[PDB]
């Protein structure tokens, strides 16, 4: 029922994601020189360094907000891909599965802890 525990749990999961070869394309904001149409296609670019910095700045209130930004990384890849068989897109789907598998307990514990706090 620790309502603060999500933050270190998210730091640890981000560390695992950064160790994962599949995160390579998503570690930093898209190179708009190599992809000059990218900002035509994608409204809000997001990457894992921006998520980590936002967390470490104390600018997430909840793991739901972090989860929304990580999901935006994956939806941006899905929107920008020219093919469902693209290398970068395919890396996004495996990394998304990994992230969802690990964030579910972080979300559940947080929401349980806040329900207990408000009981
Ligand atoms: O340039 C980068 N990222 C490099 C940065 C240093 C990490 N990316 C290109 C656009 N992206 C896509 O999702 C797709 C491309 C092809 C099909 S989808 C991911 C981000």
mmCIF file with all atom_site columns, C-alpha atoms and ligand atoms in Angstrom:
data_model
loop_
_atom_site.group_PDB
_atom_site.id
_atom_site.type_symbol
_atom_site.label_atom_id
_atom_site.label_alt_id
_atom_site.label_comp_id
_atom_site.label_asym_id
_atom_site.label_entity_id
_atom_site.label_seq_id
_atom_site.pdbx_PDB_ins_code
_atom_site.Cartn_x
_atom_site.Cartn_y
_atom_site.Cartn_z
_atom_site.occupancy
_atom_site.B_iso_or_equiv
_atom_site.pdbx_formal_charge
_atom_site.auth_seq_id
_atom_site.auth_comp_id
_atom_site.auth_asym_id
_atom_site.auth_atom_id
_atom_site.pdbx_PDB_model_num
ATOM   1   C CA  . UNK A 1 1   ? 0.000   0.000  0.000   1.00 0.00 ? 1   UNK A CA  1
ATOM   2   C CA  . UNK A 1 2   ? 3.050   2.249  -0.668  1.00 0.00 ? 2   UNK A CA  1
ATOM   3   C CA  . UNK A 1 3   ? 1.604   4.948  -2.962  1.00 0.00 ? 3   UNK A CA  1
ATOM   4   C CA  . UNK A 1 4   ? 5.165   6.175  -3.867  1.00 0.00 ? 4   UNK A CA  1
ATOM   5   C CA  . UNK A 1 5   ? 6.570   2.723  -4.827  1.00 0.00 ? 5   UNK A CA  1
ATOM   6   C CA  . UNK A 1 6   ? 5.596   3.049  -8.536  1.00 0.00 ? 6   UNK A CA  1
ATOM   7   C CA  . UNK A 1 7   ? 8.382   5.581  -9.175  1.00 0.00 ? 7   UNK A CA  1
ATOM   8   C CA  . UNK A 1 8   ? 11.350  3.307  -8.437  1.00 0.00 ? 8   UNK A CA  1
ATOM   9   C CA  . UNK A 1 9   ? 9.462   0.390  -10.075 1.00 0.00 ? 9   UNK A CA  1
ATOM   10  C CA  . UNK A 1 10  ? 9.200   2.561  -13.237 1.00 0.00 ? 10  UNK A CA  1
ATOM   11  C CA  . UNK A 1 11  ? 12.888  3.573  -12.990 1.00 0.00 ? 11  UNK A CA  1
ATOM   12  C CA  . UNK A 1 12  ? 13.833  -0.131 -12.850 1.00 0.00 ? 12  UNK A CA  1
ATOM   13  C CA  . UNK A 1 13  ? 11.560  -1.016 -15.803 1.00 0.00 ? 13  UNK A CA  1
ATOM   14  C CA  . UNK A 1 14  ? 13.022  1.877  -17.839 1.00 0.00 ? 14  UNK A CA  1
ATOM   15  C CA  . UNK A 1 15  ? 16.509  0.523  -17.026 1.00 0.00 ? 15  UNK A CA  1
ATOM   16  C CA  . UNK A 1 16  ? 15.446  -2.923 -18.376 1.00 0.00 ? 16  UNK A CA  1
ATOM   17  C CA  . UNK A 1 17  ? 13.965  -1.262 -21.482 1.00 0.00 ? 17  UNK A CA  1
ATOM   18  C CA  . UNK A 1 18  ? 17.251  0.686  -22.104 1.00 0.00 ? 18  UNK A CA  1
ATOM   19  C CA  . UNK A 1 19  ? 19.196  -2.679 -21.808 1.00 0.00 ? 19  UNK A CA  1
ATOM   20  C CA  . UNK A 1 20  ? 16.875  -4.218 -24.449 1.00 0.00 ? 20  UNK A CA  1
ATOM   21  C CA  . UNK A 1 21  ? 18.241  -4.053 -28.054 1.00 0.00 ? 21  UNK A CA  1
ATOM   22  C CA  . UNK A 1 22  ? 14.642  -3.549 -29.201 1.00 0.00 ? 22  UNK A CA  1
ATOM   23  C CA  . UNK A 1 23  ? 14.573  -0.085 -27.515 1.00 0.00 ? 23  UNK A CA  1
ATOM   24  C CA  . UNK A 1 24  ? 17.453  1.266  -29.731 1.00 0.00 ? 24  UNK A CA  1
ATOM   25  C CA  . UNK A 1 25  ? 15.156  3.232  -32.128 1.00 0.00 ? 25  UNK A CA  1
ATOM   26  C CA  . UNK A 1 26  ? 13.115  4.719  -29.241 1.00 0.00 ? 26  UNK A CA  1
ATOM   27  C CA  . UNK A 1 27  ? 15.836  5.833  -26.782 1.00 0.00 ? 27  UNK A CA  1
ATOM   28  C CA  . UNK A 1 28  ? 16.043  9.405  -28.147 1.00 0.00 ? 28  UNK A CA  1
ATOM   29  C CA  . UNK A 1 29  ? 13.642  11.713 -30.040 1.00 0.00 ? 29  UNK A CA  1
ATOM   30  C CA  . UNK A 1 30  ? 13.325  10.828 -33.783 1.00 0.00 ? 30  UNK A CA  1
ATOM   31  C CA  . UNK A 1 31  ? 16.037  12.212 -36.125 1.00 0.00 ? 31  UNK A CA  1
ATOM   32  C CA  . UNK A 1 32  ? 13.903  14.735 -38.123 1.00 0.00 ? 32  UNK A CA  1
ATOM   33  C CA  . UNK A 1 33  ? 16.825  15.065 -40.654 1.00 0.00 ? 33  UNK A CA  1
ATOM   34  C CA  . UNK A 1 34  ? 16.693  11.320 -41.616 1.00 0.00 ? 34  UNK A CA  1
ATOM   35  C CA  . UNK A 1 35  ? 12.825  11.423 -41.352 1.00 0.00 ? 35  UNK A CA  1
ATOM   36  C CA  . UNK A 1 36  ? 11.857  14.969 -42.534 1.00 0.00 ? 36  UNK A CA  1
ATOM   37  C CA  . UNK A 1 37  ? 8.119   14.043 -42.989 1.00 0.00 ? 37  UNK A CA  1
ATOM   38  C CA  . UNK A 1 38  ? 7.988   12.477 -39.451 1.00 0.00 ? 38  UNK A CA  1
ATOM   39  C CA  . UNK A 1 39  ? 6.431   15.658 -37.865 1.00 0.00 ? 39  UNK A CA  1
ATOM   40  C CA  . UNK A 1 40  ? 3.871   15.775 -40.767 1.00 0.00 ? 40  UNK A CA  1
ATOM   41  C CA  . UNK A 1 41  ? 2.647   12.259 -39.699 1.00 0.00 ? 41  UNK A CA  1
ATOM   42  C CA  . UNK A 1 42  ? 3.118   12.342 -35.849 1.00 0.00 ? 42  UNK A CA  1
ATOM   43  C CA  . UNK A 1 43  ? 1.458   15.002 -33.587 1.00 0.00 ? 43  UNK A CA  1
ATOM   44  C CA  . UNK A 1 44  ? 3.440   14.409 -30.302 1.00 0.00 ? 44  UNK A CA  1
ATOM   45  C CA  . UNK A 1 45  ? 6.853   12.703 -30.670 1.00 0.00 ? 45  UNK A CA  1
ATOM   46  C CA  . UNK A 1 46  ? 7.829   10.715 -27.518 1.00 0.00 ? 46  UNK A CA  1
ATOM   47  C CA  . UNK A 1 47  ? 10.867  8.520  -26.636 1.00 0.00 ? 47  UNK A CA  1
ATOM   48  C CA  . UNK A 1 48  ? 12.246  6.727  -23.552 1.00 0.00 ? 48  UNK A CA  1
ATOM   49  C CA  . UNK A 1 49  ? 14.825  9.406  -22.642 1.00 0.00 ? 49  UNK A CA  1
ATOM   50  C CA  . UNK A 1 50  ? 12.025  11.992 -22.448 1.00 0.00 ? 50  UNK A CA  1
ATOM   51  C CA  . UNK A 1 51  ? 9.966   9.567  -20.287 1.00 0.00 ? 51  UNK A CA  1
ATOM   52  C CA  . UNK A 1 52  ? 12.961  8.905  -17.936 1.00 0.00 ? 52  UNK A CA  1
ATOM   53  C CA  . UNK A 1 53  ? 13.744  12.641 -17.670 1.00 0.00 ? 53  UNK A CA  1
ATOM   54  C CA  . UNK A 1 54  ? 10.074  13.461 -16.951 1.00 0.00 ? 54  UNK A CA  1
ATOM   55  C CA  . UNK A 1 55  ? 10.035  10.790 -14.210 1.00 0.00 ? 55  UNK A CA  1
ATOM   56  C CA  . UNK A 1 56  ? 13.364  11.941 -12.706 1.00 0.00 ? 56  UNK A CA  1
ATOM   57  C CA  . UNK A 1 57  ? 12.226  15.619 -12.788 1.00 0.00 ? 57  UNK A CA  1
ATOM   58  C CA  . UNK A 1 58  ? 9.264   14.675 -10.602 1.00 0.00 ? 58  UNK A CA  1
ATOM   59  C CA  . UNK A 1 59  ? 6.838   15.572 -13.402 1.00 0.00 ? 59  UNK A CA  1
ATOM   60  C CA  . UNK A 1 60  ? 4.766   12.360 -13.361 1.00 0.00 ? 60  UNK A CA  1
ATOM   61  C CA  . UNK A 1 61  ? 2.083   12.238 -10.646 1.00 0.00 ? 61  UNK A CA  1
ATOM   62  C CA  . UNK A 1 62  ? 1.153   8.562  -11.297 1.00 0.00 ? 62  UNK A CA  1
ATOM   63  C CA  . UNK A 1 63  ? 2.332   5.531  -13.229 1.00 0.00 ? 63  UNK A CA  1
ATOM   64  C CA  . UNK A 1 64  ? -0.769  5.969  -15.473 1.00 0.00 ? 64  UNK A CA  1
ATOM   65  C CA  . UNK A 1 65  ? 0.728   9.205  -16.830 1.00 0.00 ? 65  UNK A CA  1
ATOM   66  C CA  . UNK A 1 66  ? 4.089   7.448  -17.515 1.00 0.00 ? 66  UNK A CA  1
ATOM   67  C CA  . UNK A 1 67  ? 2.182   4.556  -19.157 1.00 0.00 ? 67  UNK A CA  1
ATOM   68  C CA  . UNK A 1 68  ? 0.330   7.049  -21.446 1.00 0.00 ? 68  UNK A CA  1
ATOM   69  C CA  . UNK A 1 69  ? 3.654   8.502  -22.672 1.00 0.00 ? 69  UNK A CA  1
ATOM   70  C CA  . UNK A 1 70  ? 5.262   5.029  -23.195 1.00 0.00 ? 70  UNK A CA  1
ATOM   71  C CA  . UNK A 1 71  ? 2.146   3.919  -25.130 1.00 0.00 ? 71  UNK A CA  1
ATOM   72  C CA  . UNK A 1 72  ? 2.514   7.087  -27.272 1.00 0.00 ? 72  UNK A CA  1
ATOM   73  C CA  . UNK A 1 73  ? 6.054   5.865  -28.251 1.00 0.00 ? 73  UNK A CA  1
ATOM   74  C CA  . UNK A 1 74  ? 4.448   2.712  -29.595 1.00 0.00 ? 74  UNK A CA  1
ATOM   75  C CA  . UNK A 1 75  ? 1.430   4.364  -31.255 1.00 0.00 ? 75  UNK A CA  1
ATOM   76  C CA  . UNK A 1 76  ? 3.782   6.849  -32.963 1.00 0.00 ? 76  UNK A CA  1
ATOM   77  C CA  . UNK A 1 77  ? 5.789   3.920  -34.389 1.00 0.00 ? 77  UNK A CA  1
ATOM   78  C CA  . UNK A 1 78  ? 2.530   2.221  -35.537 1.00 0.00 ? 78  UNK A CA  1
ATOM   79  C CA  . UNK A 1 79  ? 1.357   5.498  -37.205 1.00 0.00 ? 79  UNK A CA  1
ATOM   80  C CA  . UNK A 1 80  ? 4.740   6.246  -38.887 1.00 0.00 ? 80  UNK A CA  1
ATOM   81  C CA  . UNK A 1 81  ? 5.478   2.735  -40.180 1.00 0.00 ? 81  UNK A CA  1
ATOM   82  C CA  . UNK A 1 82  ? 4.986   2.215  -43.940 1.00 0.00 ? 82  UNK A CA  1
ATOM   83  C CA  . UNK A 1 83  ? 4.471   -1.522 -43.314 1.00 0.00 ? 83  UNK A CA  1
ATOM   84  C CA  . UNK A 1 84  ? 3.348   -3.789 -40.475 1.00 0.00 ? 84  UNK A CA  1
ATOM   85  C CA  . UNK A 1 85  ? 6.515   -5.828 -41.406 1.00 0.00 ? 85  UNK A CA  1
ATOM   86  C CA  . UNK A 1 86  ? 8.946   -2.871 -40.878 1.00 0.00 ? 86  UNK A CA  1
ATOM   87  C CA  . UNK A 1 87  ? 12.027  -3.582 -38.699 1.00 0.00 ? 87  UNK A CA  1
ATOM   88  C CA  . UNK A 1 88  ? 11.539  -0.602 -36.364 1.00 0.00 ? 88  UNK A CA  1
ATOM   89  C CA  . UNK A 1 89  ? 7.767   -1.229 -36.066 1.00 0.00 ? 89  UNK A CA  1
ATOM   90  C CA  . UNK A 1 90  ? 8.431   -4.953 -35.313 1.00 0.00 ? 90  UNK A CA  1
ATOM   91  C CA  . UNK A 1 91  ? 10.890  -3.925 -32.546 1.00 0.00 ? 91  UNK A CA  1
ATOM   92  C CA  . UNK A 1 92  ? 8.158   -1.627 -31.136 1.00 0.00 ? 92  UNK A CA  1
ATOM   93  C CA  . UNK A 1 93  ? 5.649   -4.495 -30.887 1.00 0.00 ? 93  UNK A CA  1
ATOM   94  C CA  . UNK A 1 94  ? 8.050   -6.748 -28.955 1.00 0.00 ? 94  UNK A CA  1
ATOM   95  C CA  . UNK A 1 95  ? 9.063   -3.906 -26.659 1.00 0.00 ? 95  UNK A CA  1
ATOM   96  C CA  . UNK A 1 96  ? 5.390   -2.991 -26.137 1.00 0.00 ? 96  UNK A CA  1
ATOM   97  C CA  . UNK A 1 97  ? 4.618   -6.615 -25.090 1.00 0.00 ? 97  UNK A CA  1
ATOM   98  C CA  . UNK A 1 98  ? 7.563   -6.504 -22.647 1.00 0.00 ? 98  UNK A CA  1
ATOM   99  C CA  . UNK A 1 99  ? 6.468   -3.140 -21.232 1.00 0.00 ? 99  UNK A CA  1
ATOM   100 C CA  . UNK A 1 100 ? 2.777   -4.167 -20.824 1.00 0.00 ? 100 UNK A CA  1
ATOM   101 C CA  . UNK A 1 101 ? 3.829   -7.463 -19.144 1.00 0.00 ? 101 UNK A CA  1
ATOM   102 C CA  . UNK A 1 102 ? 5.881   -5.486 -16.549 1.00 0.00 ? 102 UNK A CA  1
ATOM   103 C CA  . UNK A 1 103 ? 3.744   -2.328 -16.048 1.00 0.00 ? 103 UNK A CA  1
ATOM   104 C CA  . UNK A 1 104 ? 0.503   -4.200 -15.178 1.00 0.00 ? 104 UNK A CA  1
ATOM   105 C CA  . UNK A 1 105 ? 1.618   -4.983 -11.540 1.00 0.00 ? 105 UNK A CA  1
ATOM   106 C CA  . UNK A 1 106 ? 2.968   -1.402 -11.148 1.00 0.00 ? 106 UNK A CA  1
ATOM   107 C CA  . UNK A 1 107 ? -0.446  0.033  -12.107 1.00 0.00 ? 107 UNK A CA  1
ATOM   108 C CA  . UNK A 1 108 ? -2.403  -2.505 -10.047 1.00 0.00 ? 108 UNK A CA  1
ATOM   109 C CA  . UNK A 1 109 ? -0.262  -1.916 -6.919  1.00 0.00 ? 109 UNK A CA  1
ATOM   110 C CA  . UNK A 1 110 ? -0.493  1.854  -7.256  1.00 0.00 ? 110 UNK A CA  1
ATOM   111 C CA  . UNK A 1 111 ? -4.279  1.879  -7.752  1.00 0.00 ? 111 UNK A CA  1
ATOM   112 C CA  . UNK A 1 112 ? -4.687  -0.578 -4.831  1.00 0.00 ? 112 UNK A CA  1
ATOM   113 C CA  . UNK A 1 113 ? -2.482  1.602  -2.597  1.00 0.00 ? 113 UNK A CA  1
ATOM   114 C CA  . UNK A 1 114 ? -4.509  4.753  -3.474  1.00 0.00 ? 114 UNK A CA  1
ATOM   115 C CA  . UNK A 1 115 ? -7.801  2.908  -2.795  1.00 0.00 ? 115 UNK A CA  1
ATOM   116 C CA  . UNK A 1 116 ? -6.387  1.872  0.615   1.00 0.00 ? 116 UNK A CA  1
ATOM   117 C CA  . UNK A 1 117 ? -5.266  5.459  1.284   1.00 0.00 ? 117 UNK A CA  1
ATOM   118 C CA  . UNK A 1 118 ? -8.810  6.716  0.507   1.00 0.00 ? 118 UNK A CA  1
ATOM   119 C CA  . UNK A 1 119 ? -10.623 3.778  2.301   1.00 0.00 ? 119 UNK A CA  1
HETATM 120 O O1  . LIG B 2 .   ? 14.889  7.847  -36.099 1.00 0.00 ? 1   LIG B O1  1
HETATM 121 C C1  . LIG B 2 .   ? 14.328  7.266  -35.174 1.00 0.00 ? 1   LIG B C1  1
HETATM 122 N N1  . LIG B 2 .   ? 14.900  7.159  -33.969 1.00 0.00 ? 1   LIG B N1  1
HETATM 123 C C2  . LIG B 2 .   ? 16.326  7.371  -33.759 1.00 0.00 ? 1   LIG B C2  1
HETATM 124 C C3  . LIG B 2 .   ? 16.595  7.963  -32.408 1.00 0.00 ? 1   LIG B C3  1
HETATM 125 C C4  . LIG B 2 .   ? 17.965  7.863  -31.833 1.00 0.00 ? 1   LIG B C4  1
HETATM 126 C C5  . LIG B 2 .   ? 16.848  7.065  -31.249 1.00 0.00 ? 1   LIG B C5  1
HETATM 127 N N2  . LIG B 2 .   ? 13.110  6.655  -35.372 1.00 0.00 ? 1   LIG B N2  1
HETATM 128 C C6  . LIG B 2 .   ? 12.523  6.616  -36.717 1.00 0.00 ? 1   LIG B C6  1
HETATM 129 C C7  . LIG B 2 .   ? 11.010  6.622  -36.685 1.00 0.00 ? 1   LIG B C7  1
HETATM 130 N N3  . LIG B 2 .   ? 10.540  5.485  -35.893 1.00 0.00 ? 1   LIG B N3  1
HETATM 131 C C8  . LIG B 2 .   ? 9.622   4.578  -36.229 1.00 0.00 ? 1   LIG B C8  1
HETATM 132 O O2  . LIG B 2 .   ? 8.862   4.136  -35.382 1.00 0.00 ? 1   LIG B O2  1
HETATM 133 C C9  . LIG B 2 .   ? 9.612   4.007  -37.545 1.00 0.00 ? 1   LIG B C9  1
HETATM 134 C C10 . LIG B 2 .   ? 10.516  4.098  -38.597 1.00 0.00 ? 1   LIG B C10 1
HETATM 135 C C11 . LIG B 2 .   ? 10.241  3.125  -39.595 1.00 0.00 ? 1   LIG B C11 1
HETATM 136 C C12 . LIG B 2 .   ? 9.075   2.482  -39.399 1.00 0.00 ? 1   LIG B C12 1
HETATM 137 S S1  . LIG B 2 .   ? 8.327   2.931  -37.947 1.00 0.00 ? 1   LIG B S1  1
HETATM 138 C C13 . LIG B 2 .   ? 11.206  5.306  -34.601 1.00 0.00 ? 1   LIG B C13 1
HETATM 139 C C14 . LIG B 2 .   ? 12.134  6.459  -34.303 1.00 0.00 ? 1   LIG B C14 1
#
